Structures are given as C-alpha cells and as structure tokens.
Design a protein around this ligand. Structure first.
Ligand SMILES: *CCC(=O)Nc1cccc(Nc2nc(Nc3ccc(Oc4ccnc(C(=O)NC)c4)cc3)ncc2F)c1
Length: 271
C-alpha cells in the first residue's frame, strides 16, 4: 500500500514465531506474513551490509523465480535493523541436514539434491546472475526434502572485509578455483567450480572439503593442480561430473545446462 514499493514489505504484517539461528548478518526468525504465510525473517545487523546497494539489487532478486531458488519476498527497510523476507525452509541448512546420519540417505537422494541445486544454478546462469558463494552452507531444505539455493549474490554487500577477498580470513577458499585465488577472476566458471565442490560435500555427507588442510594449504594444493578425490558414496559416473567442474582452465569447465544433462543421464542409468 501507500509508502511501500513492490520490493517492500510492511513489517507490521509479520508475526514472529521462532528463532532459527544467527549468521554473519545476525538473527533469522521463522514467522507468518498476514497471519497465514510462512516466511523467514532475516534481521540485518547494523553495519554488516551495504544496505542501499542491497536494496537496489533486491529489486532484481525479486524477479528471480525458480522452484529450486529460495524466493525473496521483499525487504523491510524503513527501519533498523532492516529485514529480508524469504521463503521458509522447514528442514534447515543443507550442511546440517547432510551431517544428520539418521537420514541414512540413498545415493539416489544425494543425486537428486545435486540436481535440485543444478536446476537453480542453470536458471541463474540463464539470467547471467552469479551466485558468488555457492556451497552447502548456502542451500536450504524444505519439508519435502527439496534442496534450494539461498543467498545468491549476497556476498557483494558484505562489509566485513574478512569475507570479501582472498586476503580475508573468512573467504570461501575451499570453494574457489585457481583463477579466483590467484587473480580474483570471478565468472560463471567460478560458480561451476563451487558447484563441483558442493557435489563433493553432498556425497561426503557434509565433510569439510580438504578437511585436514588449512585454507592456505588448500590454495597451495589447488594451484599445484591437485584436487579433492572421490567420496565413498559417489559412483565413478558421479565423480566424473564433479571432477569436470575442476578443470584448471576455466573455459574447459562445463555449463550448468551441460551439468544438468549429465546428472539426468546418470540418474537414468543408476535408477
Ligand atoms: C548451514 C548454515 C545455516 O545454519 N544457515 C541458516 C541458519 C538459520 C536460518 C537460515 N535461514 C533460513 N532458515 C530457514 N529455516 C530453518 C529451519 C530449521 C533450522 O534449524 C534449526 C532451527 C532452530 N534451531 C536449531 C538448532 O540446532 N538449535 C539447537 C536448528 C534452521 C533454519 N528457512 C529460511 C531461511 F532463510 C540459515
């Protein structure tokens, strides 16, 4: 209504129900919008985000719509902290989900998780939109076990420089290709590399990539042409797909469309 643009939600329409956790931007809550609709409410800690730049970009993010992307519903920005309102995902963060051994996942389930993410990424790629921090910790799981990609592009608005370059102590070194670590060259192909590492995370049931190495040691390892190796649960065909994401030459890495076709082929052959 009056006083709100299409990207703006009236915070008075929110009912807060439960705290979900605390991330780098602060607290996230579960609630309802207009008494009925489940939402996640991210309360952005003062000084953590380039808020004006994010708000302008939220207008673009609003129009990203794909079943395997966690939907942005709008922002509450008349205030502080500002809120980001998104789709609620009842089963939480993929990294934590993978690590719960009770699930006793079949490999077909793991491949489906990879396909969920690959469909989201193929969509983003078709819109020339980079994730820039793809990893299991940025995927969420709904009450039907569907995995969706979250926080696409959001790293661009982080003000804490520990996160923002390879010079930083919290940069995602373990999900970065050599050209990012060496030269800060981000591209579709750095998302492709990260996706291969995510596949590895899924098939490893949430192990940290390069688990015995520091970030520094990982960067060395990678730049010397060495790689993660095959998780026990990955068939040779699945390993070929994730490994293809790690070509030293970025242009020799597949597209998300090609990865999706490869994943579908393996599903058909392994079903
Ligand atoms: C792996 C990184 C991570 O944890 N990320 C993250 C945490 C909280 C919220 C958030 N955004 C977000 N979350 C959700 N839903 C959701 C559902 C369940 C859940 O798990 C959980 C909730 C409360 N308490 C615990 C716990 O272990 N207590 C001891 C676990 C977390 C989040 N939907 C949409 C979102 F955007 C991301």
């Amino acid at each position: 209504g009056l006083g709100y643009g299409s990207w703006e939600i009236d915070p008075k329409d929110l009912t807060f129900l439960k705290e979900l956790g605390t991330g780098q931007f602060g607290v996230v809550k579960y609630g309802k919008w207009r008494g009925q609709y489940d939402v996640a409410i991210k309360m952005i800690k003062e000084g953590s985000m380039s808020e004006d730049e994010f708000i302008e970009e939220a207008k673009v993010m609003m129009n990203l719509s794909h079943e395997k992307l966690v939907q942005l519903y709008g922002v509450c920005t008349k205030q502080r902290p500002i809120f980001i309102i998104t789709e609620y995902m009842a089963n939480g963060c993929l990294l934590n989900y993978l690590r719960e051994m009770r699930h006793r996942f079949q490999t077909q389930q793991l491949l489906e998780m990879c396909k969920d993410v690959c469909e989201a990424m193929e969509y983003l790629e078709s819109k020339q939109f980079l994730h820039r921090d793809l990893a299991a910790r940025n995927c969420l799981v709904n009450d039907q076990g569907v995995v969706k990609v979250s926080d696409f592009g959001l790293s661009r608005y982080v003000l804490d420089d520990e996160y923002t370059s390879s010079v930083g102590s919290k940069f995602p070194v373990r999900w970065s290709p050599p050209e990012v670590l060496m030269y800060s060259k981000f591209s579709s192909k750095s998302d492709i590399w990260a996706f291969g590492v995510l596949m590895w995370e899924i098939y490893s049931l949430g192990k940290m990539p390069y688990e015995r190495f520091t970030n520094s040691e990982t960067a060395e390892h990678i730049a010397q042409g060495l790689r993660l190796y095959r998780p026990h649960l990955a068939s040779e065909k699945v390993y070929t797909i994730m490994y293809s994401c790690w070509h030293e030459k970025a242009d020799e890495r597949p597209t998300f469309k090609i990865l999706l076709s490869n994943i579908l082929d393996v599903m058909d052959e392994e079903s």
